[PDB]
Amino acid sequence: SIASSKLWMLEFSAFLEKHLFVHISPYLETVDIRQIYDKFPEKKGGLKELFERGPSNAFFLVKFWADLNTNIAFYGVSSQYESPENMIITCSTKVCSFGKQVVEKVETEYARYENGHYLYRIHRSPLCEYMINFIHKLKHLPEKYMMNSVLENFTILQVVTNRDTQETLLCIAYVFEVSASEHGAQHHIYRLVK
Amino acid sequence: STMGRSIASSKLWMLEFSAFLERYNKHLFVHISQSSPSYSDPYLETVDIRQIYDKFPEKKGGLKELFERGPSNAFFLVKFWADLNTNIDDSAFYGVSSQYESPENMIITCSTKVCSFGKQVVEKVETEYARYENGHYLYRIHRSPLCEYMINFIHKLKHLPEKYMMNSVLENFTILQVVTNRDTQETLLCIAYVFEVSASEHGAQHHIYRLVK
Amino acid sequence: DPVVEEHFRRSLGKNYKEPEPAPNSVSITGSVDDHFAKALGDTWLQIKAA
């Protein structure tokens, strides 16, 4: 699972109101992070610089196979994280076109204390105008090979941070394809290394 | 009425606005401060909004439609004469800070669209809740970081050899700012900014207008 | 309730949990269109025109 020492993601989902485009609920395979640097902004704040500072056990790559097969409306994304510590977290998610940042969404969340842990919830947070328009134009293309061509160089960098210490708790890099199936989405999680 | 003498609609008032550069050193590029609506200042001069449609993105999300729907007493034009004369950034934080007041308690959305030749180049969307303090509901966007586009723009602009060259660049540079009630979707105020360099050695100026017809 | 909040803010000082903490924002610096053009070229331009 997607977990460092201080934070783990339990759930992540992008949806349309419900339709799931993309959903998530050791011995993960690895990916050399030097091979994907070009897929995310490379200067300061870059994935390379991020990796070199923050703990290397916090870095992950998720491959999604989206389910774009729906005719449904609210566009939202919901994720939830768990920690042993109580802290204030900032979730920063940058959408990237050919490695250049196109939208960045910054969210700051508190923990409710529930069962053994501190849980954090981003509940039904709305997609930006850009993303709706993107998914819309993507969804309505005449062929799946065209859709994968668009998705080829579409990526999202998600870096979650302890707002006070500025320490990075987990960093997830997403890459994309359309699902081969008529229905359903799939995913595959990787640990980012070296 | 008190309306029409400051950047204030029925539901929202701009108290303070500034873009700045920090390093401890600070430089103001652009500054505005107002009071709550009152009878102390004369009516603002007016500007025909049709003279300005062409300087902002139109079509759907556009200024014309925005004007045609929400209350027309919520619409303002600010002319800035920015102060580009500072030698810092040679470290430096580029920020913008604003502050607003409401008679009501609400949740406001501030959307700032930067525009080059009337087409949008960046958009910043901010959500602010109200802090309550003595009699007042106050909203603050404090030291909000400028985007790479804007830093680069100001840098390249700062270093031009001539102010007439600076004014030519600013000629087609505009910022549309629309503040909105997140529930009612009512537009609380909408300000259109146009720009020039200050003729002065130091300091910035402004001139506020009500947009009409 | 901001009027209640004020009392608390004033009472706890440096122990006051801001009910909606900063930072928050959405910054958009790009056109979806420009992406499709780059991925699909003429094929995308043909589709737009219908």
Among B133, B144, B148, beta carbon nearest to C6: B133
Integer Cα distance of B112 and B93 in angstroms: 19
Q: Looking at this protein, which amino acid is placed at residue B132?
A: Y
Beta strands in chain B (DSSP E): 13-22, 26-33, 45-48, 75-82, 93-102, 108-116, 119-128, 131-133, 136-145, 173-181, 187-197, 205-212
Whether A102 sits inside 8 A of C28 (CB atoms) is yes
Integer Cα distance of A30 and B109 in angstroms: 42
Tokens of A104: 């960045």
Among A110, A137, A149, beta carbon nearest to C21: A110
Mutate to test the interface with C, among B94, B104, B115, B125 (most CBs of C within 10 A): B125
Beta bridge partner(s), residue A89: A109, A162
Whether C28 sits inside 8 A of A129 (CB atoms) is yes
- Identify how the structure was determined: X-ray
R_g over Cα of chain C: 24
Restricting to C residues 1-50, those with a Cβ less than 8 Å away from any Cβ of B are 2-3, 5-6, 9, 19-20, 22, 24-29
Integer Cα distance of B125 and B98 in angstroms: 14
Q: How far apart are the first and last CA of chain B?
A: 19
Beta bridge partner(s), residue A192: A31
User: Edge-to-edge strand order for the sheet containing A117-126?
Assistant: A19-24, A8-16, A75-83, A117-126, A112-114
Q: How far apart are the first and last CA of chain A?
A: 19
8 A C-beta contact, residue B63 and residue B119: no
Domains of chain A: 1-194 (2.70.50.80)
Among C26, C40, C47, beta carbon nearest to A105: C26
Integer Cα distance of A187 and A11 in angstroms: 13
Integer Cα distance of A180 and A177 in angstroms: 9
Tokens of A166: 């500025």
Resolution (A): 2.9
Residue among B104, B102, B77, B73 nearest B2 (CA): B73
**Residue B108: CA count within 13 A, CB half-sphere:** 31
Whether B129 sits inside 8 A of C19 (CB atoms) is yes
Which residue numbers of B have CB closer than 8 Å to C's CBs?
105, 121-127, 129-133, 137, 142, 144, 147-149
Whether C27 sits inside 8 A of B144 (CB atoms) is no
